[PDB]
Amino acid sequence: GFKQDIATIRGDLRTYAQDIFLAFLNKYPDERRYFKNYVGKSDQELKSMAKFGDHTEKVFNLMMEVADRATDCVPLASDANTLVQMKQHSSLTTGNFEKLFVALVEYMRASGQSFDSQSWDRFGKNLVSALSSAGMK
Numbered sequence: 001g002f003k004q005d006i007a008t009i010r011g012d013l014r015t016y017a018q019d020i021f022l023a024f025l026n027k028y029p030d031e032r033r034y035f036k037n038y039v040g041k042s043d044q045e046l047k048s049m050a051k052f053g054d055h056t057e058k059v060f061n062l063m064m065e066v067a068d069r070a071t072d073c074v075p076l077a078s079d080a081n082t083l084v085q086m087k088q089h090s091s092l093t094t095g096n097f098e099k100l101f102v103a104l105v106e107y108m109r110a111s112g113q114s115f116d117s118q119s120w121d122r123f124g125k126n127l128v129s130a131l132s133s134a135g136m137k
């Protein structure tokens with residue numbers, strides 16, 4: 001279930017964080033624009049830029065932490081609050097997160113792995129509802 005999936009992702013954080021982020025950029029290519037330094041580079045070319053692996057791992061670490069403090073896939077208001085008020089996210093709308101989670105759920109379903117994708121679906125939706133209640137456009 002969702003709790004096992006957190007263990008799974010944590011177990012190989014770097015690999016899942018890169019594979020899922022690239023699935024996101026690839027499914028929704030106009031999102032690359034928020035990441036100036038990843039414009040014009042292949043999947044393999046990005047995996048040797050130091051900040052790409054740093055960034056992806058830190059994003060999914062934090063995502064995993066938020067996932068963990070959630071109850072029944074409902075995130076803490078204060079976690080939602082940190083995602084709105086972070087400098088890096090000032091330009092973002094909830095539409096951006098919707099996309100990440102649609103790419104994340106699509107990744108899970110495509111893997112041969114028994115992820116609880118429905119639960120990740122719910123979590124993404126609940127995180128988007130909480131981002132808005134917390135003030136994100």
Ligand code: HEM
Pocket residue numbers: 031034035054055058059060062063088089092096097100
């Ligand atoms: C739950 C999902 C997300 C989490 C947990 C998250 C978290 C983070 C974290 C932790 C960083 C800083 C990494 C570091 O210190 O090196 C970051 C930066 C950033 N985020 Fe997110 N984010 C999420 C979703 C998104 C989405 C959906 C977008 C746009 C589509 C986005 C855009 C950015 C950009 C452009 C940066 C700047 C890169 C950097 O500072 O390294 N984030 N985010």
Ligand SMILES: [Xe]
Pocket residue numbers: 021059100
């Ligand atoms: Xe992201």
Ligand SMILES: [Xe]
Pocket residue numbers: 062066078079080082083
């Ligand atoms: Xe957070």
